[PDB]
Amino acid sequence: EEVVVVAKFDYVAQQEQELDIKKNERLWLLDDSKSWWRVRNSMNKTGFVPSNYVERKNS
Amino acid sequence: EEVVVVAKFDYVAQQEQELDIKKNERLWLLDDSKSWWRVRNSMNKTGFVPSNYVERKNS
């Protein structure tokens, strides 16, 4: 459910909602069942949603 | 690449960084190649990082 993850690479956060990490840092993964996509709505609000809640429009 | 996605299901945001969405709403997916995990560091700062930059310490 919550588990510890290890950074494989550095990451410089590009927004306030992101986290800067360093290679080999250990971090809590809050929910190991959740992968998130960053989306933007018709009102120009941006945020994260669980990736399985959306799908590409091709029909 | 940016693409249009469609909500499969409603989602009520649990945190300010997430977005509320309604089934059938159309959204911009800012980067179709990018999935994120929410993590918490040793200083108890939380944020999103690309999922492929981190791996489980155990299994």
Residue numbers in the entry:
A (entry chain A), B (entry chain B): 4 to 62
Which of the paper's sentences describe this entry?
Nck proteins are composed of three N-terminal SH3 domains and a single C-terminal SH2 domain (reviewed in Ref. 3). Nck recruitment is required for complete T cell activation, and its inhibition dampens TCR signaling by reducing Zap70 phosphorylation. The objective of the present study was to initiate development of an inhibitor of the Nck/TCR interaction, specifically by blocking binding of the first SH3 domain in Nck (Nck1-SH3.1) to the PRS in the CD3ϵ subunit of the TCR. During our studies, it became clear that Nck-SH3.1 exhibits conformational diversity and can swap half the number of its residues to form a dimer.
During the crystallization efforts that led to the monomeric apo- and peptide-bound Nck1-SH3.1 crystal structures, seven more structures were determined that all exhibited domain swaps, leading to dimers. The swaps are located at the exact same position in all structures (i.e. Lys-36 in the n-Src loop), clearly visible based on the high-resolution electron density. Dimers are formed by exchange of the C-terminal 25 residues, almost half of the entire SH3 domain. The interface thus generated contains a short anti-parallel β-sheet encompassing the CD3ϵ sequence 36KSWW39. Superposition of the Nck1-SH3.1 structure with the bound CD3ϵ peptide shows that domain swap and tight peptide binding are mutually exclusive. The C-terminal half of the SH3.1-binding sequence would get into steric conflict with the second SH3.1 domain in the dimer. All of the dimers are swapped in the same manner, but with different juxtapositions of the second SH3.1 domain with respect to the first. The hinge at Lys-36 provides quite a bit of flexibility that allows the dimer to pack in many different crystal lattices. Indeed, the hinge region varies over ∼6 Å within the superposed ensemble, and the distal loop covers a distance of ∼8 Å in the dimers. Given the large number of swapped, independent chains present in different crystal forms and grown under different conditions, swapping seems an intrinsic property of this SH3 domain.
